[PDB]
Amino acid sequence: SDVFEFEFSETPLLPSYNIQVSVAQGPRNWLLLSDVLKKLKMSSRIFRSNFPNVEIVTIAEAEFYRQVSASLLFSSSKDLEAFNPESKELLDLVEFTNEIQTLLGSSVEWLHPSD
């Protein structure tokens, strides 16, 4: 089931890249599978073989780029070279955890982030 890990499955939520979602509701974070998978540095199958408790989704390239490129007025991320709105070769994203939805969503960080 889409439990997105059991937060107790020895499972690493290394700060994934996401952008302003909705400020009335609260910021969400879809974790670029391209980001996490580059972390493993292994095949896309190693992910699901290791964490079958998670699954992938995709927004259009033009989508993710749009938000990030706009947020790069304050911050700077040239890694944006990778993403391009003249292309929809899709990204990959994976659903963030309860920790993370609480972490980023409720905006809580008074330690080494852990909900």
UniProtKB/Swiss-Prot annotation:
Region feature (Necessary and sufficient for interaction with PCGF1): 1-115
Source organism, top-level taxon: Eukaryota
Tissue expression as described in the entry: Ubiquitously expressed.
Cellular localization per UniProt: Nucleus
Family listed: Belongs to the BCOR family.
Role, per record: Transcriptional corepressor. May specifically inhibit gene expression when recruited to promoter regions by sequence-specific DNA-binding proteins such as BCL6 and MLLT3. This repression may be mediated at least in part by histone deacetylase activities which can associate with this corepressor. Involved in the repression of TFAP2A; impairs binding of BCL6 and KDM2B to TFAP2A promoter regions.
Oligomeric form and interacting partners: Interacts with BCL6; the interaction is direct. Forms ternary complexes with BCL6 and SMRT/NCOR2 on selected target genes promoters; potently repress expression. Can interact with HDAC1, HDAC3 and HDAC5. Interacts with PCGF1; the interaction is direct. Interacts with KDM2B. Component of an approximately 800 kDa repressive BCOR complex at least composed of BCOR, RYBP, PCGF1, RING1, RNF2/RING2, KDM2B and SKP1. Interacts with CPNE4 (via VWFA domain). Isoform 1 may interact with MLLT3/AF9.
Disease implication from the record: Microphthalmia, syndromic, 2: A very rare multiple congenital anomaly syndrome characterized by eye anomalies (congenital cataract, microphthalmia, or secondary glaucoma), facial abnormalities (long narrow face, high nasal bridge, pointed nose with cartilages separated at the tip, cleft palate, or submucous cleft palate), cardiac anomalies (atrial septal defect, ventricular septal defect, or floppy mitral valve) and dental abnormalities (canine radiculomegaly, delayed dentition, oligodontia, persistent primary teeth, or variable root length).
Protein name: BCL-6 corepressor
Organism per entry: Homo sapiens
Gene name of this polypeptide: BCOR
Full protein stretch here: 1634 to 1748 of 1755
